[PDB]
Amino acid sequence: NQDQLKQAVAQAAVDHILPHLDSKSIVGVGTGSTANFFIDALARHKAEFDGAVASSEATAKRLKEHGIPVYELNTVSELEFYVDGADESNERLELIKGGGAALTREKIVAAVAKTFICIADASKLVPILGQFPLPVEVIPMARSHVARQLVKLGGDPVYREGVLTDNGNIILDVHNLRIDSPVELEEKINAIVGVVTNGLFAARPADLLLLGTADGVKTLKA
Template sequence: MPSDLSPIDKAKFVAAKQASLYVEDGMKVGLGTGSTAAWLVKCLGERVQDDGLKIKGVPTSSRTAALAREVGIEVMSLDEARWLDITIDGADEYDGNLNLIKGGGGALLQEKIVATASDQMVVIADASKSVETLGGFPLPLEVVPFGWQTTKTLIEETLIGMDVLGRKVSLRMNGEAPFYTDEGNHILDLHLNRIGNARQLSLVVNQIPGVVENGLFIDICDIVVIGHGDGRVEMRDINEGMVQEARHDFIETDNLFADLND
């Protein structure tokens, strides 16, 4: 791959490269959404093309599905797959217990469904996504369009009793129009600054009429693969209580990574 990437893109690439090694021949693989997950799809595509890896991918968005097909990965639906061997995805934040905030790309509902239908979830991230306490990144909630302003008011009232530092709620926009998810829903972003009890908040907000799902992934992630701009990679396994390290070198070449601008 080109060696003139920015440090953050190098970190994303080496994390994706390392995470792709968890995938074995014959696996059914959940494919995440977002810039880091796009690197993963490219890495798997390279293995499909160069090594003859045979896998079936279950994408978490239409964008990921299109990219997977482009790089030669066979795509199937979750209904066809029923259950997955592994899901690999990015995260907007992760804490020391590998709890996550996801949904910055607007695909949190499909991402959570796919992740929980997998034997294992591996998260790929750069070191900047590590936090002591979740909440610095706005927490996305997927809500149905019908009565969304009422839903927003109910969320704001509910947050008064929660252990959070901020309570601003905003409708995610796509230019001048509201953003729509692949399921035809809106996203409300909760600017909380700090979430004192993520488990409680996740349970409470999901009880609000109109809320489909939230972007807190609690007790779902098994391994986080953390990339660094110098090629170093850390693998933290929450189940085994292990931390391992690896390194990937950057070489100047012209291959399928050259057009990745996500």
Template sequence: MSDDMKRLAAERAVADVTSGMRLGIGTGSTAEHFVRALGVRVRGGLDVIGVPTSERTRALAQEEGIPLTTLEETPALDLTVDGADEIDNALRLIKGGGGAHLREKIVAAASTRMIVIADGSKCVQTLGKFPLPIEVVPFGLGATRNALEKLFVSLGLGGELTMRGGEQHPFVTDGGHYILDAHLTAIPDAETLARALVAVPGVVEHGLFIGLADKAYVAGTDGVFEMTAGSEV
């Protein structure tokens, strides 16, 4: 059922795509439905070009026959469509469950608009139940971890900080970095945490997306709901 809902949300977002658009194309299970639906429209004559946010998305887009570019060649995009691991009623997001949030955030920030596609289970009153991904440089990992733990204590946030993939075989992002997942349970002030995280040496990027999404298509048992800032979750 969840997969069907993801597909419905993705298909709704594809309807917003028009010929001539420069697209940011997200990563993850919901975004893959978008890529497949977009491929159908491209093969039907839709003229678009896309920037994929991961090597996995790039491979799928190429399979679907979607023309691709890079931010070096096309630095300004019209629209990014991507999924989310959590979304609140202010359209703040947690992303990075697939390990691509660095590229996803770069692409989203280069876009005039961002549409989020999700099923209803991703909607929350307060961000934080989903572990917050923090992408870090492998060098100095112990010091970076210590700094993050002290930061969480200073902000009154509890929870374990774990290495994605495990200490012996860490998950490595497309950019060659590691991911520390912060199990914070709740993030009452996402803006303050976001600013504090980027100030920690060794942190490359984090999974809090604030001020980037313009709307979301959220699919549930009653169909697809268009969500904007202030909508009931």
């Protein structure tokens, strides 16, 4: 099932990074269901590295519960690895992220990491991004303005009722985009004043995609 595919890619990421780790290693860590399997698998090797940088309060809490040191991103200039899930990837390793509402700090940690490993079950690999609605984090008082600007880009935005991110912002999930050019669209959405971050990880895509399939975990590159 899906959970066992998530468990598999989480373990695959641990196995991949393990030989690279040493007492100075600080691992960047995602948020959400797949990342949580990764946290628990990584913790079984906590003696092999220094600590971690979290992409959410929830992730920070889970890491601490395992006795893994959690450091603020502000204390590093680079991380060797950032490991996280996604809602969609295309074959160029351009992603839609933000289902779990943590897209902003995730995108920031990913920017500091040298190698972004995305871990996902097979169903998340799509020919063209956009069937999964694109999350956009928005300053709350900008809701109506940003929605209007997203309509101009050909989307149907929907406010995610009752949700505030770790940063105190709302999310508009944008339906009905056919995202043939994710790098271009990511830039267009960043041109909208009131947008904090958008869920396209395209200008800085994943570097490695570990995909959990019925035939095992496959390693994909752009």
